[PDB]
Scaffold this active site. Sequence first.
Site, PDB file in Angstrom:
ATOM      1  N   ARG A  54       0.806  -1.174   0.000  1.00  0.00           N
ATOM      2  CA  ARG A  54       0.000   0.000   0.000  1.00  0.00           C
ATOM      3  C   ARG A  54       0.844   1.229   0.000  1.00  0.00           C
ATOM      4  O   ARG A  54       1.510   1.504   0.989  1.00  0.00           O
ATOM      5  CB  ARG A  54      -0.962   0.051   1.187  1.00  0.00           C
ATOM      6  CG  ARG A  54      -1.886   1.225   1.154  1.00  0.00           C
ATOM      7  CD  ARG A  54      -3.097   1.044   2.004  1.00  0.00           C
ATOM      8  NE  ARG A  54      -2.827   1.604   3.241  1.00  0.00           N
ATOM      9  CZ  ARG A  54      -3.374   2.637   3.877  1.00  0.00           C
ATOM     10  NH1 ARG A  54      -4.314   3.378   3.439  1.00  0.00           N
ATOM     11  NH2 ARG A  54      -2.892   2.934   5.093  1.00  0.00           N
ATOM     12  N   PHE A  59       1.786  10.643   1.203  1.00  0.00           N
ATOM     13  CA  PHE A  59       1.339  10.166   2.483  1.00  0.00           C
ATOM     14  C   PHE A  59       2.381   9.199   3.074  1.00  0.00           C
ATOM     15  O   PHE A  59       3.181   9.590   3.935  1.00  0.00           O
ATOM     16  CB  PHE A  59      -0.049   9.460   2.317  1.00  0.00           C
ATOM     17  CG  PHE A  59      -0.632   8.859   3.590  1.00  0.00           C
ATOM     18  CD1 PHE A  59      -0.174   9.217   4.896  1.00  0.00           C
ATOM     19  CD2 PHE A  59      -1.690   7.992   3.485  1.00  0.00           C
ATOM     20  CE1 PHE A  59      -0.772   8.679   6.011  1.00  0.00           C
ATOM     21  CE2 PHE A  59      -2.276   7.430   4.602  1.00  0.00           C
ATOM     22  CZ  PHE A  59      -1.880   7.815   5.865  1.00  0.00           C
ATOM     23  N   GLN A  62       3.563   1.570   2.778  1.00  0.00           N
ATOM     24  CA  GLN A  62       3.231   0.560   3.807  1.00  0.00           C
ATOM     25  C   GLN A  62       3.611  -0.857   3.356  1.00  0.00           C
ATOM     26  O   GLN A  62       3.451  -1.267   2.195  1.00  0.00           O
ATOM     27  CB  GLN A  62       1.739   0.610   4.191  1.00  0.00           C
ATOM     28  CG  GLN A  62       1.320  -0.247   5.386  1.00  0.00           C
ATOM     29  CD  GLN A  62      -0.132  -0.029   5.735  1.00  0.00           C
ATOM     30  OE1 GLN A  62      -0.646   1.059   5.494  1.00  0.00           O
ATOM     31  NE2 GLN A  62      -0.788  -1.029   6.328  1.00  0.00           N
ATOM     32  N   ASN A 101      -1.702  -0.510  12.102  1.00  0.00           N
ATOM     33  CA  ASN A 101      -2.518  -1.286  13.016  1.00  0.00           C
ATOM     34  C   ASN A 101      -3.975  -1.307  12.553  1.00  0.00           C
ATOM     35  O   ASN A 101      -4.315  -0.689  11.550  1.00  0.00           O
ATOM     36  CB  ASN A 101      -2.342  -0.803  14.438  1.00  0.00           C
ATOM     37  CG  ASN A 101      -2.862   0.582  14.661  1.00  0.00           C
ATOM     38  OD1 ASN A 101      -3.982   0.867  14.260  1.00  0.00           O
ATOM     39  ND2 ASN A 101      -2.081   1.435  15.347  1.00  0.00           N
ATOM     40  N   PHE A 112       4.923   1.356   8.275  1.00  0.00           N
ATOM     41  CA  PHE A 112       4.953   2.371   7.217  1.00  0.00           C
ATOM     42  C   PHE A 112       6.109   3.355   7.390  1.00  0.00           C
ATOM     43  O   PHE A 112       6.562   3.590   8.528  1.00  0.00           O
ATOM     44  CB  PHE A 112       3.576   3.045   7.010  1.00  0.00           C
ATOM     45  CG  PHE A 112       3.073   3.814   8.188  1.00  0.00           C
ATOM     46  CD1 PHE A 112       2.422   3.192   9.260  1.00  0.00           C
ATOM     47  CD2 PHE A 112       3.239   5.180   8.249  1.00  0.00           C
ATOM     48  CE1 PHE A 112       1.922   3.918  10.295  1.00  0.00           C
ATOM     49  CE2 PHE A 112       2.721   5.921   9.286  1.00  0.00           C
ATOM     50  CZ  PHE A 112       2.116   5.288  10.362  1.00  0.00           C
ATOM     51  N   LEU A 121      -1.797  10.986  13.044  1.00  0.00           N
ATOM     52  CA  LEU A 121      -1.584   9.619  13.577  1.00  0.00           C
ATOM     53  C   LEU A 121      -0.945   9.559  14.951  1.00  0.00           C
ATOM     54  O   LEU A 121      -0.801   8.493  15.572  1.00  0.00           O
ATOM     55  CB  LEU A 121      -0.775   8.793  12.559  1.00  0.00           C
ATOM     56  CG  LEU A 121      -1.341   8.729  11.122  1.00  0.00           C
ATOM     57  CD1 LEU A 121      -0.422   7.842  10.291  1.00  0.00           C
ATOM     58  CD2 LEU A 121      -2.761   8.175  11.146  1.00  0.00           C
ATOM     59  N   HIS A 125      -0.667   5.501  16.249  1.00  0.00           N
ATOM     60  CA  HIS A 125       0.333   4.608  15.735  1.00  0.00           C
ATOM     61  C   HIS A 125       1.647   4.807  16.437  1.00  0.00           C
ATOM     62  O   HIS A 125       2.016   5.972  16.759  1.00  0.00           O
ATOM     63  CB  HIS A 125       0.508   4.845  14.241  1.00  0.00           C
ATOM     64  CG  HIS A 125      -0.718   4.512  13.481  1.00  0.00           C
ATOM     65  ND1 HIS A 125      -0.905   3.295  12.849  1.00  0.00           N
ATOM     66  CD2 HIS A 125      -1.844   5.229  13.283  1.00  0.00           C
ATOM     67  CE1 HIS A 125      -2.119   3.268  12.311  1.00  0.00           C
ATOM     68  NE2 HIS A 125      -2.714   4.427  12.550  1.00  0.00           N
TER      69      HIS A 125
HETATM   70  C1  LIG Z   1      -0.713   4.652   7.657  1.00  0.00           C
HETATM   71  C2  LIG Z   1      -0.952   3.433   8.502  1.00  0.00           C
HETATM   72  O1  LIG Z   1      -2.254   2.919   8.114  1.00  0.00           O
HETATM   73  C3  LIG Z   1      -2.807   1.818   8.743  1.00  0.00           C
HETATM   74  O2  LIG Z   1      -2.250   1.278   9.673  1.00  0.00           O
HETATM   75  C4  LIG Z   1      -4.206   1.515   8.248  1.00  0.00           C
HETATM   76  N1  LIG Z   1      -4.568   0.229   8.751  1.00  0.00           N
HETATM   77  C5  LIG Z   1      -4.239  -0.887   8.144  1.00  0.00           C
HETATM   78  O3  LIG Z   1      -3.658  -0.887   7.068  1.00  0.00           O
HETATM   79  N2  LIG Z   1      -4.598  -1.965   8.811  1.00  0.00           N
HETATM   80  C6  LIG Z   1      -4.413  -3.293   8.354  1.00  0.00           C
HETATM   81  C7  LIG Z   1      -3.639  -4.083   9.334  1.00  0.00           C
HETATM   82  C8  LIG Z   1      -2.583  -3.535  10.080  1.00  0.00           C
HETATM   83  C9  LIG Z   1      -1.859  -4.312  10.979  1.00  0.00           C
HETATM   84  N3  LIG Z   1      -2.125  -5.590  11.150  1.00  0.00           N
HETATM   85  C10 LIG Z   1      -3.181  -6.162  10.432  1.00  0.00           C
HETATM   86  N4  LIG Z   1      -3.444  -7.586  10.625  1.00  0.00           N
HETATM   87  C11 LIG Z   1      -3.913  -5.420   9.508  1.00  0.00           C
END
Ligand SMILES: CCOC(=O)CNC(=O)NCc1ccnc(N)c1
Length: 164
Positions: A54, A59, A62, A101, A112, A121, A125
Amino acid sequence: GNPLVYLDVDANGKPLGRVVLELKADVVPKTAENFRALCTGEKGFGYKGSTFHRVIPSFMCQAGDFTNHNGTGGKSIYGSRFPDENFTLKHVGPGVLSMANAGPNTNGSQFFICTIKTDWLDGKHVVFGHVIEGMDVVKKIESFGSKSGRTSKKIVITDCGQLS
Ligand SMILES: CCOC(=O)CNC(=O)NCc1ccnc(N)c1
Ligand SMILES: [K+]
Ligand SMILES: [K+]
């Protein structure tokens, strides 16, 4: 001292270079240790061969879902999830390294690297490091993302480890 670790990243098999990261073991020892061990692979699993799944320009980039390769999975060296260690470190600008998370106390392996200041955040985070070298490599990864987060080329951590 704080661990110094690296990610060698490719895009459809072509090398982009090396990202070097400091892990703030002095502030978040448990979170730092998790990431350090997932880079070396010493527990028998980790980041080598997994993807940036991602990537949103302006931004963050990830990665770290080395189970499902799609943002649903990952696991820590402790178990599937571990608590939020503290929120002492903040999302102060580009090159911040922070845990992804699914809510409070759901840290796993996903992480990320920020390409802007992501202060919204803060307290949500756990920040645990930053980019020492290879922000230009991060910017190359960022170039292959999109506003949807889908990448236009497969972005793979081909190797990773600890330098000191
Ligand atoms: C910029 C950071 O964005 C995020 O954290 C958005 N949330 C996600 O992508 N969550 C998905 C996720 C994260 C950690 N462990 C998992 N099993 C699933
Ligand atoms: K946005
Ligand atoms: K290695």
